[PDB]
């Protein structure tokens, strides 16, 4: 017993919103802007004295690459990248609800081609940058809901 979706992934109080970030031209703020755009959101600048506008204040990322498996000899068989991203969303009327996202990819190593493999990484890290952005878009409905109680 299905039906097709009757709004976008983003609430309607956030069709207009600020993207406050400590690093406008970073590779996070790059890939977030692009994701809100892909739900048709009106991004403002933090100059606007206009109002009713919530403000997604992005926070800082972090990326371990952790050894995550080992051959019999003890030399990392398989690393795993782990991106951790902490944001907040301010609501002008009300309150601060801090949200976040974490991604895992993982991959095998090969010293014989260590250069190739460092490349693979950059990509995976890049890819993650978007995967993260999305996880945050998918958490906005949960800010929208749990707030209405108070």
């Amino acid at each position: 017993g299905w039906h097709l979706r009757d709004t976008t992934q983003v609430p309607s109080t956030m069709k207009v919103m600020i993207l406050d970030s400590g690093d406008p031209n970073g590779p996070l703020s790059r890939a977030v802007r692009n994701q809100l755009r892909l739900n048709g959101v009106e991004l403002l600048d933090k100059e606007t004295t206009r109002k009713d506008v919530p403000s997604l204040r992005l926070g800082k990322v972090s990326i371990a690459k952790d050894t995550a498996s080992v051959f019999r000899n003890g030399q990392t068989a398989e690393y795993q990248m782990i991106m951790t991203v902490n944001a907040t969303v301010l609501i002008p009327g009300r309150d601060i609800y801090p949200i976040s996202a974490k991604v895992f990819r993982s991959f095998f190593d090969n010293p014989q081609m260590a250069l190739a493999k460092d490349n693979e990484q950059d990509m995976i890290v890049k890819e993650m940058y978007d995967r993260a952005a999305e996880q945050l878009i998918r958490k906005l409905p949960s800010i929208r809901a749990a707030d209405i109680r108070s």
Partner: protein
């Protein structure tokens, strides 16, 4: 306040360090690290700094000589052991990006014999990168230099990018269209001087048309892949392999791609009052033509993996020296579940790629377990379940019908309450058919690798009497039937001191005269005084991430 520990590597180790607040921004920490089994003091030297140009950290470790290192190569000019590490990152005025990940060591053994603070016993190479870039909203350019200390003496043949320069333009109000263009130039060089040098300019403009609905989505993507190679020093390489590399080489090709996405909702009234569910399918068509790239020596293109997200991805490889003759259609599905609080309690995704043609690059000599060239050759699936507030489970799998077999897969299940009170089990698999394919011959045909991966983990911590806190973790390769990493730790704490002590038996090498695995042991006290900041967690986390297969938390 000093520390000590006993290790098989060094027997009595102890490390008695004096910190220096040079100013704000900067400070030091100079540390005599006495090593009995070696008969000298390593001089560990840390420097941290701060600026507008971000922060960075530097380490110089100097062992002036080593008993144990002189006794295995006695007729050597010297016997010292050292390491230098530099970390930097910083964004100046949002526009200027500076970064360093530098690591250099006196020898292959350095992370076995001494501490895994910046490096690790687990690593196989030392990463040596510098990079400066310039980035704005619609544009970013970046130059860098990537070199690699390969450790084991199977081969020292490392390719390095000195330098590499990536450029990226983005235009999105070209009416209904969107455009990016990317340009890259790099020059590849090898530590052995009897190997191909090469230079490689590459351009890739991309235009696509993205279509916004309230319940659907389609983009369509047109792209060219123009690349010119110059390749010196091909006298040696061309006498070993039949397939010649040509000095100047050109390879241009384009790509039609298209991606469809649908969103169906419903309500889980049957199972839960006031729940939700979404369910999304997806398809990608991807066409890229064959080019005979066997005239290019692969420098930076290694085979990528395909987790479910990575099915919907337009590259078999990283880098740019190998691109596949893609003709194929990917299909996948993503059921999600929300609750009364719009919180994602569960998802699951499965996908597959049907290939109409082969996917080749003229250099297709990877050893698969059969002949299938087409059809549903690749499958993947992850899944997340948040059974409970305190409980969850994750897992996923990558399948390939060219292996007859799973490639790789990874389970997790977790209990958490707080950062002091938690348990986790975990398991990764990797087929010895996958190791044969994705890795070199001697991995495939020597004991320690060939038999793949099968790996079982337990990790936990119980807070006892508030002041105490136990930690530990058993990791276990099941195929060979052996321990890999095993740690036990204990942490007494209070509002003026925090004494910590633990144990690690880890894998640390492979003996070729007996051809069995060699382990290392380590036990030691480690202390500090609380009070002068709000540093009042019972200190579990630091300890969980000390072990060589560090603790990775799964969601909340």
């Amino acid at each position: 306040i000093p520390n000590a520990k006993y290790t098989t590597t060094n027997y009595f180790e102890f490390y008695l360090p004096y910190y220096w607040n040079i100013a704000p921004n900067m400070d030091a920490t100079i540390t005599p690290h006495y090593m009995h089994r070696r008969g000298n003091i390593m001089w560990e030297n840390e420097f941290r700094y701060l600026s507008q140009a971000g922060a960075g950290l530097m380490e110089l470790d100097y062992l002036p000589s080593d008993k144990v290192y002189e006794d295995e190569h006695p007729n050597d000019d010297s016997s010292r052991r050292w390491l230098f590490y530099w970390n930097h990152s910083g964004v100046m005025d949002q526009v200027w990006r500076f970064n360093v990940d530098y690591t250099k060591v006196s020898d292959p053994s350095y992370f076995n014999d001494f501490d895994n603070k910046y490096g690790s016993s687990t690593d196989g190479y030392a990463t040596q990168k510098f990079s400066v870039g310039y980035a704005v909203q619609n544009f970013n350019a970046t130059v860098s230099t990537k070199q690699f200390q390969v450790f084991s003496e199977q081969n020292t043949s490392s390719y390095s990018a000195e330098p590499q320069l990536d450029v990226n333009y983005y235009q999105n109000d070209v009416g209904p269209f969107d455009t990016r263009i990317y340009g890259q130039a790099v020059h590849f060089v090898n530590t052995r001087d009897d190997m191909p040098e090469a230079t490689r300019v590459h351009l890739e403009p991309t235009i696509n048309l993205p279509l916004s609905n309230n319940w659907g989505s389609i983009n369509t993507e047109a792209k060219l892949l123009a690349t010119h190679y110059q390749q010196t020093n091909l006298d040696w390489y061309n006498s070993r392999n039949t397939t010649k590399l040509d000095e100047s080489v050109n390879r241009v090709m384009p790509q039609f791609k298209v991606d469809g996405k649908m969103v169906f909702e419903r309500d889980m009234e049957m199972l839960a009052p006031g729940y939700t569910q979404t369910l999304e399918p997806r398809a990608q068509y991807l066409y890229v033509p064959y080019r005979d790239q066997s005239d290019i020596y692969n420098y930076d293109s290694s085979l990528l993996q395909s987790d479910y997200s990575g099915l919907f991805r337009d590259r078999t490889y990283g880098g740019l020296d190998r691109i596949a003759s893609a003709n194929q259609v990917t299909t996948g599905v993503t059921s999600r579940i929300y609750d009364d609080a719009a919180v994602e309690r569960f998802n699951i995704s499965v996908g597959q790629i049907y290939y109409f043609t082969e996917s080749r690059t003229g250099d297709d000599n990877i050893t698969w377990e059969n002949d299938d060239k087409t059809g549903s050759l690749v499958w993947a699936g992850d899944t997340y379940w948040r059974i409970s507030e305190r409980w969850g489970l994750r897992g996923g799998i990558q399948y390939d019908t060219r292996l007859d077999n799973v490639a790789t897969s990874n389970s997790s299940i977790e209990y958490r309450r707080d950062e002091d009170r938690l348990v986790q089990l975990n398991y990764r698999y990797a087929s010895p058919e996958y190791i044969q394919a994705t890795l070199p011959k001697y991995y495939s045909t020597a004991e320690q690798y060939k038999n793949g991966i099968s790996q079982v983990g337990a990790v936990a911590s119980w807070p006892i009497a508030d002041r105490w806190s136990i930690v530990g973790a058993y990791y276990y390769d099941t195929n060979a039937n052996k321990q890999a990493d095993s740690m036990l730790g204990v942490q007494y704490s209070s509002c003026c001191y925090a004494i910590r002590v633990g144990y690690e038996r880890k894998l640390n090498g492979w003996d070729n005269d007996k051809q069995h695995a060699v382990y290392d042991n380590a036990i030691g006290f480690n202390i500090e005084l609380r009070g002068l900041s709000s540093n009042y967690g019972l200190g579990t986390q630091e300890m969980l991430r000390s072990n060589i297969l560090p603790y990775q938390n799964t969601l909340h």
